[PDB]
Symmetry: C2
Subunit: 367 residues, 2 copies
């Protein structure tokens, strides 16, 4: 009866949407490439600055050029959206497009070394962050469940990879100074913690050949694992940039492996979109709308937001200090020992430290 | 340059969306009213069935008439929505409209008493849930930040009120039987804890005059609180329906108070809609997109689905059983004592029992 008409419209709308999957997939792929080159540029700039202008100048120069190439292709890929993007998507594109022109200024300062590594790192990260924020919004305008599923798996991956890039940066800073402040250490830990939800989401949503590829091509790194423990537990070697470089090179190799997988996710998504363009109701509705999947996308985007917010960072640190007190009081731990205990529980349960701390505070009646 | 170009198109699109506000606001109001009448019918049918066809026949008949009256208005409010409906909104609407025609069959069984109170309760609840699921979807085509914020606050409130209604039904069943099984008790507890995030979300998002009205009009009930404690602790009195009625009536007054506030929210939303028709980027962005607000709507829908799913219910019970074992082993608690401890922590911390359970399993290396 009336029901048939609501399905007829839903189906009409979805068939129209079919024709935008190509432009949408291409934009996502183009955002991925730009972000990747920006990640390369951020890395080279970091070493350039931490080395006092001794190293990686060539890489900075090649990086910037490759970024400029991808910028062109990104602006090209935005064209289809000019007369089709929703209000919310337009806002996301606007914020991303707003920061891009700052590259000129930023590069000059990196070149002249009139900026600190943490600052330049922060500015590259912000540009990247707003570019990535386009993706989930892109997904809100995609009705096909298979493709929306692939978009969220891809975004999850891209977001984990970005947090891996921030791990590289923060760790390089610490090893270059020869010390990790408690602040820097916490940020490093937060960048490592944060990857977990991202790649977990990716594994839950990806296709079997994709996760197979991930497990094979992106194996855990012993050296990175050891270096993480060093940064979190003791003074690094005073080898004047040598350990920083070992860290940087190992992380760079990991990031290149991740990129190899990411490129395949984008190929698979484009091919899948091509295929589609070749033509109980409640149970069916969840499979069609994928509400929990799209929520996951929003949660990762939100997690990203919080890591870039000082308000949020200090809020979470408040909880962690509280949880440390509980361990200090009821368990006779020392401050550093309390922090390490929470950190260890976070690793073992695959949760962030603030999640462990909140958990401890909710059941504190038992202490 | 290009920047202003994107902002210009956004503003322009938003301006155009102002024209859908009246029908979106109206549809939300008609959904609210239909859900309310269905809640009245659910409760009447429940007393009719639990009293073995002795009480509430008049209320059932009247309630059904009111529902039919609102269905007409609901179906009318759908006509304008058609022209602006996204694919996902179409699906939500189709789902809700798919179950509506089943009311006739359900009522006949209710009259003939050829259905159990829990079964009749569940079928009303299912129609209600799909109607409610339309509301958050309404936001996928609402660009205005203030309105979208109002829609989520309303949905949060509507959802808390629905769960309060399920609390009434579950408690009445238990008191009518003279016993709460461990099962019925968990479902009751779950309906009560579920209300917390709904009304917390409403309070965070509503306007000060709206939270004010709520704080004054919908104050906690000592009688309901005492009866909750009875249902969760000891055996209820075998007074052949007397306590059940006491429960039902207290809860029904509570729901009418909530309804008063809900009607205000709708009036306010409509006024705001009319007044709109007649009118540091990370900062501007958040204010405009309201990611936290969309997150809240997500979570409440998630909670809603979980309470409706046996898979989800049993997944969560597994966690609660594990947490109980932890208390039984490392703290020497009896099983019932263990369960009571978890429920207690959940009230005190304003979290669901499964969240308390998860918290304890997360840190149990500390007890080890």
């Amino acid at each position: 009866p009336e029901v048939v008409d609501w399905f007829a419209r839903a189906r009409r709308l979805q068939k129209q949407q079919l024709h935008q999957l190509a432009q949408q997939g291409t934009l996502a792929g183009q955002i991925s490439a730009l972000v990747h080159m920006l990640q390369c540029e951020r890395g080279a700039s970091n070493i350039w600055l931490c080395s006092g202008g001794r190293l990686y100048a060539a890489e900075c120069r090649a990086g910037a050029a490759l970024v400029d190439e991808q910028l062109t292709r990104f602006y090209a890929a935005l064209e289809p959206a000019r007369d089709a993007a929703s209000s919310a998507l337009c806002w996301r594109i606007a914020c991303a497009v707003w920061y891009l022109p700052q590259l000129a200024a930023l590069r000059k300062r990196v070149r002249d070394r009139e900026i600190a590594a943490e600052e330049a790192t922060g500015q590259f990260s912000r540009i990247i962050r707003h570019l990535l924020n386009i993706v989930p919004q892109l997904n809100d305008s995609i009705d096909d469940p298979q493709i929306a599923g692939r978009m969220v798996a891809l975004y999850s991956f891209m977001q984990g990879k970005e947090l891996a890039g921030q791990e590289r940066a923060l760790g390089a800073l610490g090893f270059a100074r020869g010390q990790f402040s408690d602040e820097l250490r916490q940020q490093l830990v937060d960048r490592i913690d944060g990857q977990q939800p991202c790649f977990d989401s990716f594994q839950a949503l990806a296709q079997p050949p994709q996760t197979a590829l991930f497990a094979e091509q992106c194996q855990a790194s012993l050296e990175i694992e050891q270096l993480r423990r060093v940064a979190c537990t003791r003074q690094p070697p005073a080898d004047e940039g040598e350990t920083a470089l070992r860290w940087f090179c190992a992380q760079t190799q990991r990031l290149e492996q991740l990129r190899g997988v990411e490129e395949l996710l984008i190929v698979d998504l484009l091919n899948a979109a091509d295929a589609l363009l070749e033509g109980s109701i409640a149970l069916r509705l969840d499979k069609q709308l994928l509400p929990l999947v799209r929520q996951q996308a929003h949660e990762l985007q939100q997690l990203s937001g919080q890591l870039a917010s000082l308000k949020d960072a200090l809020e979470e640190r408040k909880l962690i200090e509280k949880a440390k007190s509980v361990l200090m009081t009821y368990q006779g731990m020392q401050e550093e020992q309390a922090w390490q205990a929470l950190r260890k529980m976070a690793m073992d349960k695959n949760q962030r430290m603030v999640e462990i701390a909140r958990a401890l505070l909710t059941v504190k009646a038992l202490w």
